[PDB]
Amino acid sequence: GHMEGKPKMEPAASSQAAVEELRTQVRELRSIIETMKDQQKREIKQLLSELDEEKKIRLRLQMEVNDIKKALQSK
Amino acid sequence: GHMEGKPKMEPAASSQAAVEELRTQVRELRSIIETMKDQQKREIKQLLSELDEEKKIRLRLQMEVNDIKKALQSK
Amino acid sequence: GHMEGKPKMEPAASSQAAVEELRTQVRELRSIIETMKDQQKREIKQLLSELDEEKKIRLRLQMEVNDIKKALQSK
C-alpha cells in the first residue's frame, strides 16, 4: 500500500527515520531533473551546429550556380 | 547523515514539521520537471523551424539548376 | 502553510500516514523525469533525421552543378 492515511490516524515508531529517508529521495530527484536538462540541452546544441555547417555548403553551391546562370543568360 | 533508520526505530519531536517541510520539496520537484520539459520543447521547435527555412532555399536552388541543365542538354 | 516547523516542535497523530503519502509523491516524481527525458530524446532524434535527409538532397544538387561547371569552363 501507498499514499494511505484514511484508515490510520496515529503516530508510529521510526518517525524520525522515515522522514530522514524521504528527505534523501527528495533531493535526489532535484539532481535528476538538473542533469536531465543538461543532457537534453547538449543534444539540442549538436543539432543546431549541424544545421549551421549545412547552410555553409548550400551558400557555396548557390554562388556556383549564380555564375553559370549569368553566362547562360548572356548572348 | 541521510536515509538512515536501521540504528533508530523510535519517533521524535517535530514530526509534523518534518513532514510539512518534506511535502513542500516534493511539490517543488514536480514543478521543476514541468518547466524543464517546456524549455527543452521550445529549443526543439526552433531547431525544426530552422531546418524548414533551409529546405525552402535548397528547393529554389534546385529549380535554378534544372533550367540550366535543360539548355545544357539541348543541342 | 508549508515548510513550517519553527513555531512547532512536537509530534502529531497520523505520523505514519503522512510519511506514506509523501513517499508515494517522491517516487512519482522520479518517474516523471524519466518519461520526460524519453520524450525530449525522441524529438531530438526526429530533428537529426530530417537534417540527414536534407543533406542527401543537397549532395545530389552539388553533383548536378559540378557537371554543368565542367562544360561551362570547357572551350
Using what technique was this structure determined? NMR
Give the separation between CA C40 and CA C63, rounded to whole angstroms: 36
- How would DSSP label each residue in A4-52? --SS--S--S-HHHHHHHHHHHHHHHHHHHHHHHHHHHHHHHHHHHHHH
Among the partner-chain residues A9, A58, A64, the one whose CB lies closest to the CB of C14 is A9
Residues 6+ apart with CB under 8 A from A17: B4, B5, B6, B8, B9
Written as one string, the DSSP assignment of chain B is --S--SS--S--S-HHHHHHHHHHHHHHHHHHHHHHHHHHHHHHHHHHHHHHHHHHHHHHHHHHHHHHHHHHH--
Residue A7 has a CB neighbour count (10 Å cut-off) of 7
DSSP 3-state assignment of C26?
helix
Of A13, A29, A44, the CB nearest to B9: A13
Query: What are the chain B neighbours of C54 within 8 Å (beta carbons)?
Result: 51, 54-55, 58
Q: Which of B9, A64, B55, B3 is nearest to C16 (CA)?
A: B9
Check CB contact of C3 with chain A, cutoff 8 Å. Answer: no
Q: Which residue has the cell 548536378?
A: C64
Q: Quote the crossing angle between the two packed helices C15-73 and A15-73, to the nearest 10°.
A: 10
Query: If DSSP codes are grouped into helix, strand and coil, which group holds residue A54?
Result: helix
C-alpha cell at C49: 533525421
Q: Is the C-alpha dihedral spanning A43, A44, A50, A52 positive or negative? A: negative
Cα torsion through C14, C15, C20, C22, rounded to 10: 110
Residue with cell 547562360: A72
Take residue A51 and report the three cell numbers written for it.
544545421
CA distance B49 to A29: 33
φ, ψ dihedrals at B2, nearest 5°:
-155, 150
Cell of C56: 542527401
Tell me how far apart the alpha carbons of residues A19 and B18 are, in angstroms, rounded to a whole number.
7
Q: How far apart are CA A12 and CA A19, in angstroms?
A: 12
Cell for A33? 531533473
Is A33 in Cβ contact with B33 (below 8 Å)? Answer: yes
d(CA C49, CA B59): 18
Residue C61's Cα: distance from chain center in Å?
33
**How many CB atoms are closer than 10 A to CB B22?**
23
CA angle, residues C43, C32, B47, in degrees to nearest 5: 20
B18 with C5: CB under 8 angstroms? yes
Which chains are adjacent to chain A, needing at least 3 Cβ pairs under 8 Å? B, C
Task: Tell me which amino acid residue A62 is.
Answer: Q
The string of DSSP codes covering C41-66 is HHHHHHHHHHHHHHHHHHHHHHHHHH
At C5, which amino acid appears?
G
